[PDB]
């Protein structure tokens, strides 16, 4: 039987108690689960459904619909790279080349240590600072390979 570690379950209960209805907390709970495990473990969904008082198929359908949730790959740090119009115009391909030179991986791949996954995303709405990437919650303009290397060195 899969069980949420007490420190996670406490946070999930806080989200569920925050909104007037429990089911409104579903996305905040799944963010919290992904933050804890580095992905959404399939086994996590049944106990979450129970806490939200929703059918399991409802929760599964929500996880499948929302692109930020990942049931496939565990990663400590998600490098979200914008592949939309403005970042493409201003040098997404230079950022991807620099990421491949430093980490040895392409969009969709995880480093062999499970540290970094490159996630291609649509417009991150920081287009004046193109090309844009995030490292988990942190968001940056890509300037050059030397600058990117310094930034990535801060994630240990």
């Amino acid at each position: 039987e899969f069980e949420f570690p007490e420190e996670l379950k406490t946070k999930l209960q806080e989200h569920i108690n925050y909104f007037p209805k429990k089911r409104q907390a579903i996305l905040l709970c799944l963010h919290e689960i992904q933050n804890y495990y580095g992905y959404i473990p399939p086994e996590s969904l049944k106990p979450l459904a129970d806490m939200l008082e929703l059918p399991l198929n409802h929760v599964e359908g929500v996880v499948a619909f929302y692109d930020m949730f990942d049931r496939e790959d565990k990663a400590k740090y998600r490098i979200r790279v914008c592949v939309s119009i403005v970042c493409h115009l201003m040098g997404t391909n230079k950022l991807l080349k620099a990421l491949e030179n430093i980490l040895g991986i392409k969009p969709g791949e995880v480093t062999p240590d499970g540290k970094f996954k490159i996630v291609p995303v649509q417009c991150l709405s920081a287009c004046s600072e193109a090309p844009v990437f995030m490292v988990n919650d942190d968001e940056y303009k890509f300037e050059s390979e030397v600058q990117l290397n310094e930034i990535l060195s801060r994630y240990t």
Partner: protein, 418 residues
């Protein structure tokens, strides 16, 4: 506390209203906001009737800054003719390509938005308000949660706000990667703990919204105007810009300009003035080829003298200005727009589901020179046939910008057809 890293987007204002504080790239907390006379508009509003506030917002000419430009006062009037309880929703899902106007209010001057939400909620008799912020704005989320706690501490939220007898709580919900969750009915479905599937309209949210109750959805930038309308009065607000499309507007400018960033300007400003007078002209002084109004419209270099207003011949939309210069491939640019709609259709409507996919799949073959004659004819047909049976704006416009590039840059498309 410390927040996640945010790029320091350049912000410039000729009006010193929405960007009075947000022109500086840092969090302005409640003490700084109060020093500038913050929350005095709320105090003024709570001494007015809800009906009077609606009248002022109506007379201000404020139009929906989310991009459709629907008259804000008239939206509120529709809501309040329906029995309560009623809900107020702040739309902070901002996900249109090139559009970064709302985030600089959220991340730099959150109390301007919060004050606006409280006044708007009182105006329509809502005791529960929601901010729905996209998942990819985690800093915005933490800044808003902290700002709401500051407002509670100072007695601007909770029960019986400043002895008015008006109760309000503001809940912050997060998105999780879906552009479609900015569509007001898909947003409401997401708030209800479901997939972001748009609802058939009518009914509009003001008739049937959150839990089927009358619900007003307004954009961050729209709501940020409300404290100015109350503070100045609707007459003084109408002095700003042209009297038919009045008030400050935020213009997020990106791509091939010297000074990319957000400009607070009146809506009588022309597209040419945004690019050349404010954004410093083009990179390398190259000729403008096109302006993408996010993923909605493509304007040619012949259309730069149009006003940035909500008029029939105006720029309209979000005010988003993506500048392409003479060396940028329009078909390459069209492929990026097709890829966007492919990735974001929710799939409820068949022509939208298949059309957004086929438009991107066929345009990729065209771009790579692998398209058969039937792929070419297929692409043309699919582009014209995404809209049929569509129940939201995505299917209605998924072919719009691309069709405008086929009409305005035929020479460039023909190069690919060979």
């Amino acid at each position: 506390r410390s927040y996640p890293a945010i790029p320091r987007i350049y912000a410039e204002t000729t009006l010193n209203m929405l960007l009075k504080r947000a022109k500086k790239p840092r969090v302005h907390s409640i003490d700084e906001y109060l020093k500038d006379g913050g929350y005095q508009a709320l105090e003024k509003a709570l001494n007015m009737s809800p009906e009077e506030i609606i009248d002022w917002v109506d007379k201000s000419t404020l139009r929906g800054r989310g991009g459709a430009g629907f008259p804000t006062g008239k939206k509120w009037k529709f809501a309040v003719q329906n029995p309560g309880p009623r809900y107020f929703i702040c739309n902070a899902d901002e996900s249109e390509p090139g559009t970064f106007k709302d985030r600089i209010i959220i991340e730099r001057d959150p109390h301007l938005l919060i004050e606006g939400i409280i006044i708007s909620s009182y105006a329509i008799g809502a005791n529960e308000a929601y901010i729905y912020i996209r998942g990819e704005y985690p800093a915005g989320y933490y800044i808003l949660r902290d700002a709401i706690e500051e407002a509670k501490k100072k007695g601007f939220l909770g029960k019986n706000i400043l002895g008015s007898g008006f109760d309000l709580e503001i809940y912050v919900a997060r998105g999780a990667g879906a552009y479609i969750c900015g569509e007001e009915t898909a947003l409401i479905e997401s708030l209800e703990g479901k997939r972001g599937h748009p609802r058939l309209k009518p009914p509009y949210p003001v008739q049937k919204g959150l839990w089927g109750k009358p619900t007003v959805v307004n954009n961050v930038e729209t709501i940020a105007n409300v404290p100015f309308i109350i503070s100045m009065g609707w007459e003084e607000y109408r002095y700003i810009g042209p009297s038919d499309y009045a008030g400050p507007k935020l213009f997020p400018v990106s791509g091939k300009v010297k000074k990319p960033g957000v400009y607070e300007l009146p809506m009588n400003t022309t597209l040419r003035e945004v690019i050349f007078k404010y954004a410093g002209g083009t990179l390398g002084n190259k000729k403008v080829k096109a302006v993408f109004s996010g993923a909605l419209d493509c304007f040619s270099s012949e259309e730069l003298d149009i006003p940035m207003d909500y008029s029939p011949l105006g720029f309209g939309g979000t005010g988003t200005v993506i500048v392409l210069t003479e060396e940028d491939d329009i078909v390459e640019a069209a492929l990026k727009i097709a890829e966007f709609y492919e990735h974001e259709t929710c799939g409820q409507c068949t022509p939208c589901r298949v059309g957004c996919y086929e438009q991107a799949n066929l345009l990729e073959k065209i771009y790579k020179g692998e398209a058969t004659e039937q792929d070419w004819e297929g692409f043309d047909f699919v582009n014209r046939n995404i809209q049929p049976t569509s129940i939201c704006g995505l299917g209605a416009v998924a072919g719009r910008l691309i069709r405008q590039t086929l009409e305005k840059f035929p020479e460039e498309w023909e190069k690919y057809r060979k």
